Chains A and B, each alone.
Chain A
Amino acid sequence: FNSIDRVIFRVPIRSEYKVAFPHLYNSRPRSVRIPWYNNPVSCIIQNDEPALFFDPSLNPIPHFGDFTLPEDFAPLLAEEEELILPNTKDAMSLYHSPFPFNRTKGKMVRAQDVALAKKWFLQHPDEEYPVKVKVSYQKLLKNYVLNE
Chain B
Amino acid sequence: FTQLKKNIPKTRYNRDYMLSMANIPERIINVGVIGPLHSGKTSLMDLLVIDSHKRIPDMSKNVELGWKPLRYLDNLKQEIDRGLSIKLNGSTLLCTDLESKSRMINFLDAPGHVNFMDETAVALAASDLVLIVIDVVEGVTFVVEQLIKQSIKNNVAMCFVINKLDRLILDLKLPPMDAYLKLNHIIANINSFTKGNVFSPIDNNIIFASTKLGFTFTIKEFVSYYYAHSIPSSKIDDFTTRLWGSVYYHKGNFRTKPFENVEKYPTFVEFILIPLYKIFSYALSMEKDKLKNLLRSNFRVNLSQEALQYDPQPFLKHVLQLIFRQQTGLVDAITRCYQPFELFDNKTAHLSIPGKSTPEGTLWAHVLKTVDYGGAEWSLVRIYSGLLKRGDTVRILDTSQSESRQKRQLHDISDETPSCEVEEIGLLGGRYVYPVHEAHKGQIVLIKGISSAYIKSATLYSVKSKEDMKQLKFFKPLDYITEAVFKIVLQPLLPRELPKLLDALNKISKYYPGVIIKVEESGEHVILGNGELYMDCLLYDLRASYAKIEIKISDPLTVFSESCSNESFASIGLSISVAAEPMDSKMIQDLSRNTLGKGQNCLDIDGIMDNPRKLSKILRTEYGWDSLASRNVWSFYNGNVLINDTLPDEISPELLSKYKEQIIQGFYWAVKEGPLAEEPIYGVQYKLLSISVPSDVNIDVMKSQIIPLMKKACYVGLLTAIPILLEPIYEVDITVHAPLLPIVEELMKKRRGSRIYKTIKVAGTPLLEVRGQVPVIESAGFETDLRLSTNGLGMCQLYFWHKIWRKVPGDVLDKDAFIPKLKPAPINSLSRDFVMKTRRRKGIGPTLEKYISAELYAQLREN
Cβ-defined contact, B172 with A58, below 8 A = yes
Decide if A71 touches B251 in the complex (CB within 8 Å).
yes
Do A77 and B82 form a contact, CB below 8 Å, given A58-B766, A87-B285, A103-B311? no
Chain A interface residue bracket vs B? 35 or more
Whether A102 pairs with B790 at a CB distance below 8 angstroms is: no
Which residues in chain A, 91-124, are within 8 Å of chain B measured between CB atoms?
Answer: 91-92, 94-96, 102-106, 108-109
Interface size range on B against A: 35 or more
Question: Among residues 525 to 555 in chain B, which have CB atoms less than 8 Å away from a CB atom of chain A?
Answer: 532-533, 535-536, 539-540, 543-544, 553-555
List residues of chain B with CB within 8 A of the CB of A65.
253-255
User: What residues of chain B have their CB less than 8 Å away from a CB belonging to chain A?
Assistant: 37-38, 78, 81-84, 113, 135, 137-138, 167, 170-176, 178, 181-182, 184-185, 188, 226-227, 230-231, 235, 238-239, 242, 251-255, 270-271, 274-275, 277-279, 281-282, 284-288, 294, 298-299, 308-313, 315, 488-489, 491, 524, 532-533, 535-536, 539-540, 543-544, 553-557, 735-740, 742-743, 746, 751, 761-768, 777-778, 780-781, 784-785, 787-795, 821-825, 833-834, 837-838, 840-841
Within the complex, the shortest CB–CB distance from A57 to chain B, in Å, comes to 5
Number of A-B contacts (CB under 8 A): 280
Partner among B751, B784, B794 whose Cβ is within 8 Å of the Cβ of A16: B784
Provided the pairs A23-B540, A43-B171, A43-B737 are in contact, do residues A10 and B823 lie with their beta carbons within 8 angstroms? no
User: Which residues from A are CB-within-8-Å of B837?
Assistant: 5-8
Give every chain A residue within 8 A of B821 (Cβ-Cβ).
4
Residues of A bordering B, CB below 8 Å: 2, 4-11, 13-14, 16-17, 20-26, 30, 33-45, 47, 51-55, 57-65, 67-73, 75-77, 79-80, 83-85, 87-88, 91-92, 94-96, 102-106, 108-109, 131, 136-137, 139-141, 144, 148
- B252 in contact with A71 (CB, 8 Å): yes
Would you list 28 pairs from A and B whose C-beta atoms are within 8 A, ordered by A residue?
A2-B491, A2-B554, A10-B555, A10-B824, A14-B784, A24-B532, A36-B81, A36-B83, A37-B83, A42-B171, A43-B766, A45-B173, A55-B173, A55-B766, A58-B764, A59-B762, A62-B185, A63-B181, A75-B271, A77-B278, A77-B298, A83-B277, A95-B170, A102-B313, A106-B311, A109-B284, A141-B740, A141-B742
Partner of A54 from the list B178, B279, B532 (CB cut-off 8 Å) is: B178
A96 to B167, CA, bound (A): 11
**Interchain CB contact under 8 A, B833 and A8:** yes
Closest chain-A Cβ to B277's Cβ sits at a distance in Å of 5
Q: Beyond the given A30-B544, A137-B740, could you list 8 further A-B residue pairs with CB under 8 A, ordered by the A residue number?
A: A2-B489, A59-B766, A63-B184, A68-B253, A69-B239, A79-B298, A80-B282, A94-B312
Q: Which residues of A contact B751 (CB under 8 A)?
A: 11
A9-B766 Cα distance, complex, nearest whole Å: 38
Tell me the bound Cα distance from A9 to B834 in angstroms: 10
From A37, A44, A68, contact of B252 by CB (8 A): A68
Chain A residues with CB below 8 A from B238, complex form: 67
A75 to B81, CA, bound (A): 45
Q: Are A88 and B284 in contact (CB under 8 A)?
A: yes
- Chain B nearest CB, measured from A147 CB (Å): 9
Q: Are A14 and B781 in contact (CB under 8 A)?
A: yes
Q: Which residues of chain A are near B825, meaning CB under 8 Å? A: 9
